[PDB]
Structure 1
Amino acid sequence: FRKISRDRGIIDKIISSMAPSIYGHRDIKTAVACSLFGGVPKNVNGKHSIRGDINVLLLGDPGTAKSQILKYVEKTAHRAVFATGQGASAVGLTAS
């Protein structure tokens, strides 16, 4: 890990390795890459907290593999939970 961490173009190797069999859409691939690594959460005592999670919205015309990206994120991420807008319910998301 330390060896690759200091290699040339480490950020470009990461982004170009997001979804290898998807062409272009590099502004999404860089957005997918950043959402996987995430930020650093902060909690100031006696004040409110700050989230470190990165939120991505993929809006596009039919095609463009928006769904296949979420299928690639499901397998690569450590703990991935997949949901669908119509197949989910208010109880099925919050609690039972």
Structure 2
Amino acid sequence: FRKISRDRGIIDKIISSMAPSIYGHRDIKTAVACSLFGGVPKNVNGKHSIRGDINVLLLGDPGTAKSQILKYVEKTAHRAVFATGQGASAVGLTAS
């Protein structure tokens, strides 16, 4: 780990190791890497919180392989869950 970390330009290696089977779309892969690494949550003396995770929205025309990236994120991550808006899924969004 530490050795690979000392090679200048580890960022562009990571950005090209993401969805390794969809053509182009570098910006979305950069955003995927950013949201798949994260950040630092913060509490200022137990009275002020700034979140750490970075949210990513995809808006695209029919046939641009968004579901493929969503599939990749689930194989690559530790704690990832899948839910569908208009379909049949094994988990919903509301508590009950």
Q: What is the TM-score of this pair, normalised by structure 1? A: 0.90
Runs of 4+ in 1 over 3 A off after TM superposition: 87-92
Q: How does 1:48-67 map to 2 (within 5 A)?
A: 48-67=48-67
User: In the comparison of the two structures, how many residue pairs are matched?
Assistant: 96
CA distance in 1, matches of 2:87, 2:36: 25
CA distance in 1, matches of 2:8, 2:26: 19
CA distance in 2, matches of 1:88, 1:46: 41
CA distance in 1, matches of 2:19, 2:77: 12
CA distance change for structure 1 residues 78 and 89 in 2, over 3 Å: closer, same or farther? closer
CA distance in 1, matches of 2:61, 2:4: 37
Shift of 1:46: 4.1
Q: For structure 2, list consecutive stretches of 5 or more residues without a partner in the other structure.
A: none
Q: For structure 1, list consecutive stretches of 5 or more residues without a partner in the other structure.
A: none
CA contact (8 A) 2:83 2:91 kept: no
Shift of 1:88: 7.6
Q: What is the TM-score of this pair, normalised by structure 2? A: 0.90
